[PDB]
Amino acid sequence: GIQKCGLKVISSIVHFPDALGAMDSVLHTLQMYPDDQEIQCLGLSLIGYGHLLAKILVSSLYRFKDVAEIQTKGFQTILAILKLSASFSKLLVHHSFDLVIFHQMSSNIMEQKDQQFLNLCCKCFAKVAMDDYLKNVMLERACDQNNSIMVECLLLLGADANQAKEGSSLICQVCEKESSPKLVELLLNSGSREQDVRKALTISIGKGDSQIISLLLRRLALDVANNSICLGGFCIGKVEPSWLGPLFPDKTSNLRKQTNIASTLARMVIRYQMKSAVEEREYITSLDLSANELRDIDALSQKCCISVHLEHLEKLELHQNALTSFPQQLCETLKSLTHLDLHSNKFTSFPSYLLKMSCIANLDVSRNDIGPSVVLDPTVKCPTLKQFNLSYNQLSFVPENLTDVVEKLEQLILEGNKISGICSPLRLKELKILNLSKNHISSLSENFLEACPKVESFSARMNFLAAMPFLPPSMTILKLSQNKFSCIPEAILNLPHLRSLDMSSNDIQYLPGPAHWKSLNLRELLFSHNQISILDLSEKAYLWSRVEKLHLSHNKLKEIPPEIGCLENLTSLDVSYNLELRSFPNEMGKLSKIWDLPLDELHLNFDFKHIGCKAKDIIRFLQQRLKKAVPYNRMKLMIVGNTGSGKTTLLQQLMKTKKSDLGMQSATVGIDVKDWPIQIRDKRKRDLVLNVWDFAGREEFYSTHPHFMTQRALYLAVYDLSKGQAEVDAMKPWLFNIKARASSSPVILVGTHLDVSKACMSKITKELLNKRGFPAIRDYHFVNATEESDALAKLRKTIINESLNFKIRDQLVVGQLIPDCYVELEKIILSERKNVPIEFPVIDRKRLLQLVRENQLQLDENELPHAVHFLNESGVLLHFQDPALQLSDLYFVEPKWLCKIMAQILTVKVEGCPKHPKGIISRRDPKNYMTQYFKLLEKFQIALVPSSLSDHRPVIELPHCENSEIIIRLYEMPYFPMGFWSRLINRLLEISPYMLALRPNRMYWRQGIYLNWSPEAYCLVGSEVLDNHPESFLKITVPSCRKGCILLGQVVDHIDSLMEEWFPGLLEIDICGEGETLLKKWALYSFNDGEEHQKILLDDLMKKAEEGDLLVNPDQPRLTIPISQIAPDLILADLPRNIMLNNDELEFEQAPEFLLGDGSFGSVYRAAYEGEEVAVKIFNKHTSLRLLRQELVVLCHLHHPSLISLLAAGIRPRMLVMELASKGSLDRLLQQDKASLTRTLQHRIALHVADGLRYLHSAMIIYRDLKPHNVLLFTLYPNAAIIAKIADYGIAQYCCRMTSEGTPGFRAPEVARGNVIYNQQADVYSFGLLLYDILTTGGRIVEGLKFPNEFDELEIQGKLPDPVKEYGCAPWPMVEKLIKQCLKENPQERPTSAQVFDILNSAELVCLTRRILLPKNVIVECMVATHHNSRNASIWLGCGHTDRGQLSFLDLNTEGYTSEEVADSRILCLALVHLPVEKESWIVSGTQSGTLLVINTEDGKKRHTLEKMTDSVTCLYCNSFSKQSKQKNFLLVGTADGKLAIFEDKTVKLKGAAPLKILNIGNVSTPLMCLSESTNSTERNVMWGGCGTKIFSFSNDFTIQKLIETRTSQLFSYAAFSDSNIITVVVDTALYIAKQNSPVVEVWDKKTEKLCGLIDCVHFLREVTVKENKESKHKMSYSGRVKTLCLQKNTALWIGTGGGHILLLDLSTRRLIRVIYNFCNSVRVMMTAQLGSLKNVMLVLGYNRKNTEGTQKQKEIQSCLTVWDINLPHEVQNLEKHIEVRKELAEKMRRTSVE
Ligand SMILES: Nc1ncnc2c1ncn2[C@@H]1O[C@H](COP(=O)(O)OP(=O)(O)OP(=O)(O)O)[C@@H](O)[C@H]1O
């Protein structure tokens, strides 16, 4: 008890002599005498002059929370410490500082005059909250303790509320601690992710809360702008009325303002933050409850709080729940429900009281288990039901009483049921769409449709039907597929309006000719899978001139008659899979409209499908054969041998080259292409000329031969019998490669030696070489090969007879017909071969396109790519259409040259120094040709020379080789094909991005690679020879770990993508004999992990069939091996591990169709995977596993929030799992739900699709097909995170199996013309059209279905019409410009995908409703709207371009600008006075002369110029002053000195009315310039009007009650900003004032009359106009001044600058929201209005001036009225959050790739 005196002494001397373990003892004396004797606890004062200091401060102030003014001594200390050690704050917040600073600022300090104190504590708090992290804990540690006041302060200071753990965060926490509703309301209204709010439901659903739930639903599912509740995807276990209560709107709800407390502290702290930083009705309709698993809805069927808002529902969805027994009481409560659907529920009986509903249509109960009979009560009458869906129930009879119950029914759908019996007359008077598919119907009563005279779309698929009852004469569409028919019944032939007919999969025999159909409107005739013999069209064919689809596939057709050219409109012919056609008629060339034409599984009179022949050229080709076609006699005769034979010395005698002047010739280099004609001097004048290719035999050129071994050729082969019976063996490889490359070509063995001896070699050729896997040897001779002889002459004869009988697939190749346009093209190239630089005979397409000009060739740019290819197969010129090899401009004429150059490199050796290993070589060699040289060799892959490369293999010693860590897979084949290794080791070589760009150091000899990253990941594609085996194997050993399972599954692909691309006859099932298949890809497995002494072979074909289970095991079934280990590619184990199917959780029913709901009659089903809803895609027999594995590799690494993402993929069966687009594709939406798109969902869809293209075009992959059918919506809630998602499977099937031209309607001009390769600018034109169908809500497609040939051509040139003038839709004039950019003809003039999104991300395009270009050179400076008529509105303008005034009426929907002179002096302002009587609303006009004129709304002739004033009228107004217990109003003419004349609303008619109270306020030197009225109506609409520089006010008294003056302002930086005239003033909780040429607004106050805020403009403009505006450095005399003010109700303040900008200031919390520039030049007038029940718009009358004649001291002004959606300040910040959440998802999705 002496320490008090000790500290009292120290406090004295610590001051005067500047005292310097003082702080130590004065600290421990606290801990020694704590919680007592506050006098010694005042020692804190000395601390103002080891973190123990922290722990001793927060513990002192807290324990004395409200003791005395020791807090003032505490905080002073804490403030003194902070300003010198700013780091100290990290220690305070670390302790209990939160516990003590939250109490002070909230211990009822408001309402208490301790302003001196609070300013201290806020100053102290201003520094604790400096660090970005500290706010995030100052906030989090203010939510645990329920503190609404402070949690609001820390939000206005930043401190994001979505940061805690991401998976878990504040809202999940705040909902666990049973917080206050006011606390949740602040996190949601601030930054708060959707994925965290949704998790807060299930947390807050478990517990029963009525105010914490109803605040989460309001943010998750309530589209107030569209009157909807989108509670679909949520798995809310049960719905209760107490939750949906506060969602429905209430008109009585109006609140006070109490959060201003937290708003004051928000700015006080911000003030001290800167000062320390600067110096140093409308009942909602849609209610969706889809996915919520509700086992009962009874909770709504009571008289609860919402039973008065449900009576205006008009739509209710309960599909995919588990409901049953729709409650009787409810269906009588919602007496306005007009769209009810409840399908996939577990019903078991039709309620039959649902029809008692008042006004119902589109009742949809269509997947439940409704019992046998569904009899409707015969005493209920529902004349409003239009569509009665009952599909996929369990009905066994048609519903009973449709006629007596639902009279006006339109679409009775009954598919999927089990309807069995012969039906009943079904006397429905207004059916339009029947449906009876998938039932078991045997036959219909002959009077079935005898009472429904309006049917249009009867459809009975998959039944057992044979005859048709009378069909009414009104049928249009009629589908009868999968039935059991015999002949098209005579009742269908006589339908005089039929317009489509699907009769697939029936067994009909005779398709009647067009003279039997009695209806000229045939459009489609699907007849696939029938048994149709003839296609009789000769009797009369023009009757089908409109047919647009004639599907005849899978029929027994024999020929296509020539009259099929009469079907001029035929758009999609389909005659595939006929197997007996053999010919297309040359008349088919007249089908100019065909865009697809399948050729699958039928052999024609030409060789198609090279890379082209895309069903459009085939029509051109067949058309050129109609002008003049001539036979083409030209074949290839390949000569083949091996380093010593009669190849080049037998040919010289075959051609009978008489000279052979070279006494001694040399071995061949290259292949020596030559041609000799054969003029067979016989009866047949066919002078065939076949070109010989005497291949070189030396084993070093073999790497290049497979390029020139085509399939249209007759191969020779030469023994060299001198080495009898030993050379025939050495010739098997050649015969094998002939079999590998060209299986269907003949072979003529030619024993070349007789002169020198052994001729029993005909035995082995007949024994082993004849018919064993080798090609079809058609002869064998034994010529002499050095002199003409009888033995040789009979060989020359066999070459002829074997050529003229080539006949591949019964075609006789040597004598086919081709268009003379080709033969003439052949003659000019040969005639040009003599006129080309021998050093480089190559020709560029430029030179080629001129050769046709010199002659009269009728070929176009679409013909040459086919023409010049048909000349390639014939060996006239070489040309390669590969896109990767960038030489397709080079056209190799004189093939014998290129074929010689490619072999000069393989012979150039160096007998100098072997400084390099064998096989590698650098560029050691004319004019730029050497550069062109290996710009072709590298293109030809021969560059490092993969041939002649270190045959001897190096002894590799693999790290882990213990028989259980390695995976092996042999490829036993009889001989390595010719160009196998040099091709293989050059396909795996260039793949460095394995394990994806880390290149592995590799060592590749001639027949191996062995590229290894580490002893844990390698791949050795070797080649060894087994023991006692003459085959040739390809062993591939890979480590069995995860990084190794990838390499195997990635090499086996390349080695197979090569085998079928190059040697397709290796993997060819030879059904003759047995299925040897010539290539047996074994796999190796061993049960003993190590020391197995052998690895047992196991064919892959047999093992792949063992996919029924997952384990393999021997005949001793104790132990077993997982197939993953031995062949991890058949099982999808190489792809990312997250996509293993894991069948234990996938619940999926393939067989049923009621779960196949996706689309219509498709293949992708619906299922559940990990408890969530997904969409599995069952694959048919088409897609082989090798391709499915080829597609998944590209789908697995897209990972975008705007691309359908995979979830799993597996076998049993080959299925593919993806996300379930809940609301289905987009095309189905705008086809039947056109009211759901609401001008802000039309945008988020276009933004999410332009976000997908922003990523696809980033990964260098073009979509190539973007249509309203490929966009899969996910929810119809506008302010959601994932709405649209473009289906990404389409590109996978293309990038693997390469609709490549795109759907006709949704197609670019560069892709339809087909003459130019595509670009990324094709997906933009296709997207530009997608914006045209979203804008017009699918109006082009609906009309495009009955004009399909004009559906494509109209848009294929940019000639499609205006989206507004044609189709009725709201303008949206900032996207009609984005269309007119993405719809340009030039490809590189359309905005790239990154730009088409950066101008969709703008939040100003989505609000600007319609820009209205005023007539040229009209100067208007005043406007007024008409709000008493809400049917439609008009804007009465003024005029300035004349000194004599004139009003300018202007509509809004017709935009008819009208001129009517009404005065003789320029007009300055107007006002609109309405009278509740007589139904009129006059307009008043203030002009410079003072003539106050008034004219009627209708009559433009009844006018009376009221009592003229003295100065120029400047401001008028119409008020709300009804103070006589009834309706009454005045008008306030603002003269230019203050003679405010007040009037009456009904007295305006009389000429010269009575100015009630002329209140001369100021002087002639004080002109009035504005007027206003209060924001609230509680204070009796106190008026606040400006005058000169003196602001005033009044009330019902009409006397000045305030005379605030602004020039006397004591905050002078500049003076005349306040010493100038006023312009406008708006009334709120404060006052905002505008002066002439003032770039600042002045925030005065009502009571205090002080400058509470000063907001300069350029403080915002100069912060964005820094880099994007560089020239402004000379513009220090800035332009842009406040011209007008407009204050939204409580949200933002619209400031119109003298420039082109417009300011959005959130008057509550944050100042700058956005500055909307570059849309005008001078925002001169701005005000609000309401338009046609789409109220609350913000008219903005800007200017526009172009200095066309600025040198003539004149400017051309164009006033540009606009209309902004008043919800703009929300949208601009609601969108900037919408992009943040998607950026946060676009990155986290990129992490699932690496993780
Ligand atoms: N993930 C998904 N979620 C929801 N619906 C889907 C999904 N994927 C596809 N669908 C719908 O399923 C239907 C079938 O789509 P599919 O891809 O089979 O069409 P398609 O490719 O034209 O058919 P086909 O290949 O037989 O021509 C489509 O109408 C589509 O809208």
Ligand SMILES: Nc1nc2c(ncn2[C@@H]2O[C@H](COP(=O)(O)OP(=O)(O)O)[C@@H](O)[C@H]2O)c(=O)[nH]1
């Ligand atoms: N004595 C003889 N020599 C032949 C016969 N046929 C070809 N030759 C020789 O084969 C050589 C032709 O080279 P060739 O083996 O065709 O070269 P490759 O095309 O590279 O295999 C000539 O020099 C001839 O001497 C023949 O019937 N009798």
